[PDB]
Design a protein around this ligand. Sequence first.
Ligand code: BB2
Ligand code: BB2
Ligand code: MHA
Ligand code: MHA
Ligand code: ZN
Ligand code: ZN
Lengths: 169, 169
Amino acid sequence: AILNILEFPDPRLRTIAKPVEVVDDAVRQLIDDMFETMYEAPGIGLAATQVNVHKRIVVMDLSEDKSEPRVFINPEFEPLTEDMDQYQEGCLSVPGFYENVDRPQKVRIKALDRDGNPFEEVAEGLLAVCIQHECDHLNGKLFVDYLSTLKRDRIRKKLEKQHRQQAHH
Amino acid sequence: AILNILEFPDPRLRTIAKPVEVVDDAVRQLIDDMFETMYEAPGIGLAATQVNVHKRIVVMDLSEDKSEPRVFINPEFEPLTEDMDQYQEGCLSVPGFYENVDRPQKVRIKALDRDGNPFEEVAEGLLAVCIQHECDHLNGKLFVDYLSTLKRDRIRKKLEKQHRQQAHH
Ligand SMILES: CCCCC[C@H](CC(=O)NO)C(=O)N[C@H](C(=O)N1CCC[C@H]1CO)C(C)C
Ligand SMILES: CCCCC[C@H](CC(=O)NO)C(=O)N[C@H](C(=O)N1CCC[C@H]1CO)C(C)C
Ligand SMILES: NC(=O)CN(CC(=O)O)CC(=O)O
Ligand SMILES: NC(=O)CN(CC(=O)O)CC(=O)O
Ligand SMILES: [Zn+2]
Ligand SMILES: [Zn+2]
């Protein structure tokens, strides 16, 4: 099923997600709904926090033909270099806005797979950017948090305006 | 200490490496010697089999400045995709030759780290190719084994001539 995606400045996006203790079929059902929601948006990644489920679960598919699904449960990352890359990021929870964000160029991801088994994976490029962006969501952080207060304020005001107009529909 | 690197068609390269039961002082010394040997060659990977030590130990460093050492003890891998990647592969035991070899582009690695602790790592790109190349060595397999019979024999003949001339130096 398609799930509702929370939008900035909804305070629920600031909730810190709780770790998953057992990866059962119920967790996999949520994962399937997250994937369906992500593919339909469309987006290349999605954190449970974004659909109002505060558990540390992330889904992703960096392919063009939407044929490479990846699951990260209880994800964490550690920079493997001090070098930083700049990427213009967008977010399904901050629809319509794209801004530059500087983040570690390479990181080591650690998480549980869709079966609950632990693994690690070195990430560079888009994968590195996405994993950091998704993990941030689980810690109640949004990419607009890295921007100047004036830019974030402009975005907030534009979105709050849109929300009021959408409410008048 | 820099160890000697065996070269095709030396029969000892066909030896199947035995598993490591404990990462003791001796094993720790070998790993250091292997890194020294690898960097001096220079190469981006090295299997114990290549320095005539038939234990399942692999070292790597895909960086350009010796800043990313990697250790794999008792490594094994499983393809995670059917998609094949073609890469121009070379080998310190088959110096001067680079031939295309098709291998799965994404694999899951299972091994023990430099401290003797088990871990599983998802690999793509160069890392995916190198781990398969290195594990093959531990099973007495060389990349030329994937080439046609005439191409492999041509390479063999070339090296035998070289070895012949080197001995007269
Ligand atoms: C930069 C990496 C961002 C991680 C994923 C986000 C989706 C998200 O909100 N995850 O929490 C995404 O797909 N964002 C899209 C996006 O910004 N993309 C998608 C591909 C490249 C990049 C271009 O800016 C937009 C169009 C919704
Ligand atoms: C492609 C992966 C190969 C695994 C590593 C080998 C070394 C080896 O013999 N390992 O067992 C290597 O460093 N090979 C080099 C090599 O083939 N390379 C190094 C970087 C890229 C690639 C192609 O040129 C050459 C130059 C000796
Ligand atoms: N073994 C894997 O597929 C690795 N991971 C995700 C990845 O592909 O990066 C686990 C998951 O998708 O459940
Ligand atoms: N977390 C890691 O460093 C993983 N591994 C190997 C790697 O770097 O891929 C351990 C080792 O190098 O002993
Ligand atoms: Zn987002
Ligand atoms: Zn080799």
